[PDB]
């Protein structure tokens with residue numbers, strides 16, 4: 099009796115930034131219009147980004163009030179934390195209320211809380227703040243995952259599976275919330291990686307309810323979490339790095355990350371399915387939620403697994419409509435896949451297919467996979 | 478077939494700071510010898526600390542090279558992180574190798590890693606760094622617990638229990654490591670909480686191996702992890718607060734923390750043991766590992782549970798010889814208990830008793846308890 103995803107909810111900040119407008123906005127508000135060299139590079143990145151819009155908490159007024167945020171290397175962690183330590187739990191609350199509504203049970207039935215964010219850190223943590231906001235039982239069993247990065251949307255499902263399967267009757271609320279205000283940096287030719295994050299990173303929160311043994315006529319499973327695997331891709335420690343500094347959360351992104359993912363995807367898929375049935379080819383038989391760290395990562399997975407046109411539609415849709423929101427993104431993709439499956443009259447939440455995978459990719463490079471089964475479309 | 482603790486190892490930095498000498502050291506190296514008011518307050522706190530010595534990575538030469546560390550409020554996070562992001566995994570490695578030696582199995586048999594620290598934060602994290610240092614399998618399943626605080630020595634056992642019990646054959650390495658360089662602050666009459674941390678906080682690392690179904694005649698259990706509970710004590714959000722800031726990890730401590738623990742201990746103990754048996758427990762029938770956040774917390778547990786003289790000896794011994802090292806401290810206490818039980822010829826690792834508890838206490842206030850059973854000495 100495996101752990102099941104029983105509900106998914108999502109949320110984003112209200113302010114929409116269309117990619118067509120973002121170069122103009124970024125260069126104007128950061129006083130960098132003279133950097134026509136960097137604007138050329140940024141335009142090219144945005145054109146290739148396959149991201150049409152993003153939701154962001156950060157506003158121009160916040161930058162005007164705190165110009166150190168766009169002054170590369172200037173001290174600004176404290177103002178960023180003052181924002182994110184409040185806004186991350188709040189955005190998580192909105193997603194959680196949506197998941198709880200879908201789930202249909204009283205909040206008092208939640209026994210476990212996993213909160214994940216790479217956007218802030220505080221003691222007590224976001225988990226404690228969310229307990230207050232939602233009125234969760236004060237004795238909920240908590241896991242607070244700080245600063246894991248972009249594999250964690252799969253990792254939190256793995257953790258929830260073990261908690262839900264080993265604790266009879268447990269119901270795990272999983273909340274992943276990101277506010278990228280802490281990662282916003284100004285522009286310098288000595289740190290061009292910032293142009294990539296400025297084009298792709300975005301804000302959002304997901305909430306998932308996980309439990310084994312669904313209650314008939316109340317609970318309705320969407321996916322089953324069958325097996326998981328986490329691995330470090332060889333010789334890729336420089337792939338994604340982020341340091342918590344006086345200047346905020348600074349980050350570095352190697353241009354070789356897509357090549358590392360493509361060079362390892364057959365292997366990490368094969369070793370994951372060794373835990374299930376030994377599948378080693380014919381990857382088009384699965385449905386997929388792939389963390390869209392950037393468009394080239396999605397393209398590498400498609401190419402090296404030999405995926406047919408449209409196999410990664412749900413992944414690409416979320417990248418287009420929301421950008422890379424970090425750990426929550428794969429949950430947005432599962433929600434989109436469930437929604438489109440309803441629209442199309444599919445027999446299951448996984449595009450009509452039985453088996454699928456979630457692929458999270460982040461620092462290490464670390465890849466966490468979760469093999470899922472879909473569920474029949476009901477209620 | 479519950480999860481069992483199969484090994485415990487510990488480590489500390491090499492520099493010993495005897496409490497008798499610490500006020501002189503602190504006020505000299507931070508250039509505060511003129512603050513006779515603050516010195517008298519600090520002397521009184523140290524006298525009541527029940528801490529005889531502590532091990533610290535921080536040295537006077539580091540303070541001389543980085544005086545922003547002792548200049549209250551000055552930007553210093555970057556230098557602190559540059560130290561702790563290296564030193565936390567290295568100290569954890571030392572403790573882990575000791576645990577792995579006791580366990581007696583190859584490093585390649587470890588399937589899961591939990592790393593816990595409140596002393597630093599980085600991406601990739603300390604778990605990744607420890608994988609490199611030890612040569613763990615690159616596919617170990619990891620949980621990296623950053624900035625939980627002083628309840629986490631119980632929490633990591635709860636997490637290890639679930640991972641070990643839900644994954645056949647799993648062997649979990651758990652490492653908690655603290656280097657308080659990130660929490661060191663200078664002295665100001667506007668923030669007297671620093672005097673308490675300066676008297677009590679200390680450095681150390683623990684490592685525990687956890688697995689269900691130990692191999693007969695190859696692995697030897699020390700304790701069984703039976704059941705766990707985490708709870709927030711009502712109306713105590715101001716008890717322990719720590720913020721990650723440009724000045725380092727700043728913290729505030731309410732003088733009411735001991736009274737909050739005492740006012741809730743019967744309840745949290747009762748509700749924890751309700752998860753195991755419906756009969757009332759005699760608290761003196763248990764062995765105890767209590768997080769010694771300060772001496773008054775230990776006294777409050779003793780008083781409100783009606784514990785007999787000497788029941789908390791192992792807890793008090795660790796506080797005396799090591800100070801409050803954060804999350805690892807309860808593991809040092811279990812190790813001390815096991816060692817003293819060998820010395821005394823007791824029949825079990827838990828002072829000759831069958832049932833016991835680990836009590837972790839930290840921000841929230843949050844208390845996490847883990848009910849243990851002892852094992853035969855063998």
Ligand SMILES: CC(C)(COP(=O)(O)OP(=O)(O)OC[C@H]1O[C@@H](n2cnc3c(N)ncnc32)[C@H](O)[C@@H]1OP(=O)(O)O)[C@@H](O)C(=O)NCCC(=O)NCCNC(=O)CSCc1cc(-c2ccccc2)on1
Nearest residue numbers: 146276299340349351352353355391392393394422423424
């Ligand atoms: C970049 C595109 C779209 C462009 O398209 P393209 O590169 O395919 O085409 P082309 O190469 O021909 O042109 C592109 C031109 O841009 C330049 N160029 C590309 N790449 C880099 C780079 N890497 N450095 C410096 N320059 C770079 C080249 O130089 C080239 O110019 P030139 O070479 O032709 O002269 C594509 O590559 C792609 O998807 N890349 C993969 C990106 C990647 O790593 N995603 C993983 C994201 N990881 C993280 O977020 C974790 S980190 C800190 C952190 C963040 C969070 C978080 C995040 C979000 C939300 C909440 C929290 O939590 N933690």
Ligand SMILES: CC(C)(COP(=O)(O)OP(=O)(O)OC[C@H]1O[C@@H](n2cnc3c(N)ncnc32)[C@H](O)[C@@H]1OP(=O)(O)O)[C@@H](O)C(=O)NCCC(=O)NCCNC(=O)CSCc1cc(-c2ccccc2)on1
Nearest residue numbers: 521525655678719728730731732734770771772773802803
């Ligand atoms: C304090 C003693 C020893 C005194 O001994 P006493 O009671 O016998 O004598 P008395 O009270 O009569 O006299 C004492 C004099 O000091 C003053 N005074 C006392 N109390 C406070 C306070 N609260 N504020 C401001 N002044 C305070 C009085 O006013 C009096 O002043 P004056 O009148 O004499 O001048 C005793 O009370 C006691 O144990 N209390 C409970 C202590 C406690 O909660 N520890 C919680 C530990 N939490 C944490 O580590 C997490 S936090 C940030 C953080 C740290 C870490 C971490 C830590 C270690 C390692 C790795 C990571 O991760 N995160």
